[PDB]
Amino acid sequence: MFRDKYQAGFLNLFYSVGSKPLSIWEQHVENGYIKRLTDPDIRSCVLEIVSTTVNNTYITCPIDPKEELAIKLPFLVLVLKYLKKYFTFEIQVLDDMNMRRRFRASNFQSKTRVKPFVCTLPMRLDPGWNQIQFNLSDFTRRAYGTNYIETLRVSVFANCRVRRIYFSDRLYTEDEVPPEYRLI
Amino acid sequence: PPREFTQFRRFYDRGDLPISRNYGDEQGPIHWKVSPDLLDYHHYLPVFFDGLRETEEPYWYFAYYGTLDLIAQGPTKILAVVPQLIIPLKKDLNTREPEILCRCMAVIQALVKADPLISEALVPYYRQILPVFNEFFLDNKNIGDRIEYSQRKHNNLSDLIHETLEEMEKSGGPEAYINIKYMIPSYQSAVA
Amino acid sequence: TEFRRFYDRGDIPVRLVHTTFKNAIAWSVDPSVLDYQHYLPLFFDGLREKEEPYRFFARKGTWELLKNGGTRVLQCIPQVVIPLKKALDTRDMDIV
Amino acid sequence: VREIVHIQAGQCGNQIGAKFWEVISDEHGIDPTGSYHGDSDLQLERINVYYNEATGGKYVPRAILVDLEPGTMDSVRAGQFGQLFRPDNFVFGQSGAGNNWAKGYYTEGQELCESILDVIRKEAESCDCLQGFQLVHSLGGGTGAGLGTLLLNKLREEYPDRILSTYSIVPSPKVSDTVVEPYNCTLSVHQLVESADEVFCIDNEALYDICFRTLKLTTPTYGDLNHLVSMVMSGTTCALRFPGQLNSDLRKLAVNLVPFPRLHFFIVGFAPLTSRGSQQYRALTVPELTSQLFDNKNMMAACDPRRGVYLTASAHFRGRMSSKEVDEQMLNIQARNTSYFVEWIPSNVKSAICDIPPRGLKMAATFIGNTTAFRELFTRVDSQFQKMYARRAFIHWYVNEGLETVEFDEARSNMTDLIQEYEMYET
Numbered sequence: 001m002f003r004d005k006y007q008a009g010f011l012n013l014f015y016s017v018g019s020k021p022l023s024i025w026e027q028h029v030e031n032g033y034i035k036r037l038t039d040p041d042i043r044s045c046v047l048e049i050v051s052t053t054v055n056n057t058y059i060t061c062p063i064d065p066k067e068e069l070a071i072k073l074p075f076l077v078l079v080l081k082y083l084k085k086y087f088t089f090e091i092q093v094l095d096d097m098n099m100r101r102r103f104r105a106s107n108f109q110s111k112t113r114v115k116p117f118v119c120t121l122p123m124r125l126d127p128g129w130n131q132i133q134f135n136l137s138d139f140t141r142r143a144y145g146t147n148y149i150e151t152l153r154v155s156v157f158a159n160c161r162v163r164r165i166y167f168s169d170r171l172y173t174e175d176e177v178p179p180e181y182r183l184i
Numbered sequence: 185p186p187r188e189f190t191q192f193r194r195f196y197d198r199g200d201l202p203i204s205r206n207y208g209d210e211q212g213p214i215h216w217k218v219s220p221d222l223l224d225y226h227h228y229l230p231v232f233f234d235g236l237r238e239t240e241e242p243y244w245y246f247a248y249y250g251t252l253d254l255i256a257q258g259p260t261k262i263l264a265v266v267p268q269l270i271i272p273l274k275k276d277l278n279t280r281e282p283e284i285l286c287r288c289m290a291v292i293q294a295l296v297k298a299d300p301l302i303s304e305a306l307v308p309y310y311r312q313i314l315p316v317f318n319e320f321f322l323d324n325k326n327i328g329d330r331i332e333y334s335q336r337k338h339n340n341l342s343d344l345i346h347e348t349l350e351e352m353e354k355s356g357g358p359e360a361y362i363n364i365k366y367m368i369p370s371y372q373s374a375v376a
Numbered sequence: 377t378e379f380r381r382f383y384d385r386g387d388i389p390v391r392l393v394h395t396t397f398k399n400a401i402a403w404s405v406d407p408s409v410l411d412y413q414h415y416l417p418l419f420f421d422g423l424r425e426k427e428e429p430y431r432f433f434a435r436k437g438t439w440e441l442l443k444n445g446g447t448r449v450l451q452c453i454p455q456v457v458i459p460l461k462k463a464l465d466t467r468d469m470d471i472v
Numbered sequence: 473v474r475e476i477v478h479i480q481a482g483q484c485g486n487q488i489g490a491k492f493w494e495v496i497s498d499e500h501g502i503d504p505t506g507s508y509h510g511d512s513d514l515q516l517e518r519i520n521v522y523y524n525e526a527t528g529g530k531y532v533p534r535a536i537l538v539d540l541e542p543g544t545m546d547s548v549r550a551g552q553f554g555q556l557f558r559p560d561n562f563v564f565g566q567s568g569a570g571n572n573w574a575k576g577y578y579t580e581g582q583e584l585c586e587s588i589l590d591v592i593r594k595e596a597e598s599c600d601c602l603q604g605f606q607l608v609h610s611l612g613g614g615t616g617a618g619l620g621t622l623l624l625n626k627l628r629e630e631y632p633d634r635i636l637s638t639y640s641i642v643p644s645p646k647v648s649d650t651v652v653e654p655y656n657c658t659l660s661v662h663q664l665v666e667s668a669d670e671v672f673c674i675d676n677e678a679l680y681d682i683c684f685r686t687l688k689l690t691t692p693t694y695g696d697l698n699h700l701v702s703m704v705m706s707g708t709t710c711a712l713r714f715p716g717q718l719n720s721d722l723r724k725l726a727v728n729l730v731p732f733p734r735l736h737f738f739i740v741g742f743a744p745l746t747s748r749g750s751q752q753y754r755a756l757t758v759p760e761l762t763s764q765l766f767d768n769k770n771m772m773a774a775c776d777p778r779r780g781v782y783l784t785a786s787a788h789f790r791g792r793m794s795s796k797e798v799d800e801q802m803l804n805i806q807a808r809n810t811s812y813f814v815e816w817i818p819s820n821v822k823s824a825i826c827d828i829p830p831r832g833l834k835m836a837a838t839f840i841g842n843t844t845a846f847r848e849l850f851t852r853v854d855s856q857f858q859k860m861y862a863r864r865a866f867i868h869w870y871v872n873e874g875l876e877t878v879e880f881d882e883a884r885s886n887m888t889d890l891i892q893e894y895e896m897y898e899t
């Protein structure tokens with residue numbers, strides 16, 4: 001699904017100013033909460049996820065476990081607030097000869113092992129709002145070497161404040177974007 | 185635990201100043217009979233700290249806002265009275281009602297901001313204070329994707345804990361974090 | 377064929393011109409900047425298609441690129457022989 | 473896809489908003505405790521606009537109640553839908569105003585601000601699409617007017633794009649309830665003009681006049697007047713929640729009606745209105761709706777449009793009707809009264825239809841218009857203010873707050889400038 005729809009420019013997947021921004025998103029909560037609130041930081045719409053055990057609390061898209069996304073765009077951009085706590089998220093991608101491949105990055109990670117079934121990345125952020133961009137095509141060709149194929153599933157875990165999750169066809173720097181597709 | 189009798193009521197019936205709520209002036213919530221600078225700090229402020237435990241007017245309104253004004257106007261002198269404030273402050277926290285602790289956390293946040301030396305002097309007193317915080321730490325509620333009103337009451341007690349703990353952690357210095365771990369297992373440092 | 381997958385989502389840079397007289401193809405990407413090592417095997421795969429829209433694009437793109445590319449075809453021979461083998465072993469009435 | 477957070481200052485405003493929630497819950501079929509027990513699946517198409525769901529199948533409304541003394545909140549909790557409001561939705565001050573506009577704004581406003589802003593805050597990042605708040609307040613009093621104007625500024629600062637839709641009750645010019653009122657309204661107008669995107673004016677004198685022209689209620693109470701205001705609010709926000717055949721929202725209405733940034737004060741009206749006994753005789757049709765909407769005896773504003781001319785107009789319809797009949801009316805009544813339409817702004821009238829009418833009232837309509845007749849309203853309060861100001865006895869009450877004497881003059885100068893702007897635009 002998303003297969004036959006037009007996919008050019010920008011294509012968002014979570015943005016808290018719709019009507020049920022998790023209408024396509026699925027939430028799993030344990031030892032924590034998904035709560036939606038306002039920050040004095042930006043005065044603009046945000047969602048919060050906080051939990052004691054990060055692995056047991058996450059959001060995944062799409063809702064249907066058996067069904068998958070057909071988004072073509074190679075760039076995934078996250079605009080999130082770092083809560084000075086343990087954070088992780090994972091992405092699923094298909095490759096040229098049809099093997100499912102998955103990346104999961106963590107801030108409490110240690111190494112960058114690329115054993116076949118799942119790749120792991122350590123990363124560090126800045127306290128406040130971050131604007132991480134993940135070029136899936138570059139990463140797939142760098143790690144495994146296979147070219148890029150459309151993206152299957154996206155999951156974000158607890159202890160982070162997320163306000164946008166959108167895809168872009170190519171890399172846009174600041175101000176070559178819609179005025180709200182950036183940081184206030 | 186019954187309502188341990190508050191000294192502030194006994195000081196207020198005969199001698200306390202903040203009765204004045206009358207304005208033809210560009211002034212705030214409360215007024216003083218005399219300028220607070222002339223007052224001593226060993227007698228008035230500890231009594232004011234005890235008054236936050238009051239539940240009915242006019243006692244608690246004067247005590248809460250009187251504490252805020254005194255801590256704002258006279259931040260230099262409060263360092264001497266810091267040891268004497270532990271006992272009345274510890275009385276208020278043990279009430280555990282979701283209203284007194286909000287006032288106490290507001291005072292504490294207004295207290296640590298006054299001087300980094302004050303917070304360094306509160307490091308030995310963490311063990312006397314934090315157990316109430318260590319109980320209420322994880323009382324947030326799961327609502328999913330829809331709305332929080334509690335913050336206009338300013339009564340989401342958990343969120344007050346997080347900011348206030350972050351405030352002692354910044355001003356506490358080198359040994360504040362390890363003491364916090366000894367009281368709060370689920371806390372993780374926000375030093376950077 | 378797999379060539380259906382790329383064309384079905386508007387990835388193959390070709391379009392059809394209905395100049396009434398002979399159906400012809402137009403390039404969304406000029407042949408100069410085309411990555412022959414990537415696009416050439418896909419055009420060879422489209423020959424196995426049956427219905428008209430993919431069949432016409434496959435023939436025109438394959439013949440055009442082969443007859444104008446030049447020496448750039450030489451490196452792509454081992455990659456395009458395998459789809460050519462798949463096309464032949466169909467034993468089809470008109471794919472052969 | 474359009475979620476609105478509703479704000480209520482005002483002893484008047486809090487009562488009006490409560491009756492509005494009565495109307496919405498009856499329309500949607502909501503138990504005054506928030507449990508759905510209705511009969512129409514269309515009621516849940518867009519219920520998220522006005523409500524939240526709490527875990528347990530309970531719906532909580534996007535309602536903010538603002539006051540400075542707990543008396544009104546105690547009355548609201550004694551109301552039918554007091555349990556519908558989340559208990560944290562209410563805030564009240566601890567030092568009353570007594571309709572002193574300066575006291576509420578200056579001394580009480582600053583303390584109130586740090587508390588009040590943050591539901592306006594945390595509703596914003598969690599109301600699923602914020603394209604506008606909604607505020608109902610009184611202008612003659614001190615608590616609603618001063619605090620509402622102050623919060624309107626903070627709403628504009630924190631939320632620039634979101635539409636600040638405001639509904640205000642104008643001081644009654646023959647007699648209104650308060651008499652600090654000319655001072656209060658003068659100071660609130662200057663704040664309202666610059667920040668609020670839309671301002672709607674209602675007069676109690678017109679409401680009583682309408683009741684005795686149309687309703688023939690021998691002895692009405694406040695409940696009827698606030699119910700009519702609830703009808704107007706239901707008609708204004710109906711297009712967002714329910715289907716139709718042609719619909720305009722708040723931003724469309726701002727686009728369609730506002731020709732210039734400061735000419736956005738609008739009159740409001742509702743049809744049909746009929747006495748409880750004579751409704752049987754009346755055959756309710758589209759021409760009957762059009763005649764009632766544009767008839768002067770039905771305007772809920774103390775300003776005769778016949779003394780002025782129309783700039784822009786808007787009409788909305790609830791229920792299933794033919795568009796040809798509606799637009800047949802919109803041409804012929806536009807041509808009938810060419811003496812009231814400005815020559816260089818044609819297309820003054822706009823049309824809209826919503827599919828679901830309210831209960832019992834099979835066919836419904838709501839009219840919002842713009843006319844130069846607004847100039848009479850500001851003239852009356854200016855005339856009353858002039859000799860009151862001419863002997864400064866009352867401003868010393870406001871000066872002791874901290875308000876400068878020059879503050880009254882800049883509001884008066886802005887008021888006169890606003891009057892002049894509407895005078896040139898007539899020609």
Ligand SMILES: Nc1nc2c(ncn2[C@@H]2O[C@H](COP(=O)(O)OP(=O)(O)O)[C@@H](O)[C@H]2O)c(=O)[nH]1
Nearest residue numbers: 482483484571610613614615616617649650694
């Ligand atoms: N229309 C209407 N007006 C009311 C009602 N209750 C109070 N008012 C008006 O509210 C005004 C006084 O408001 P005030 O006590 O100063 O509170 P404020 O609205 O916050 O300024 C008076 O002019 C009353 O006429 C009501 O039920 N309906």
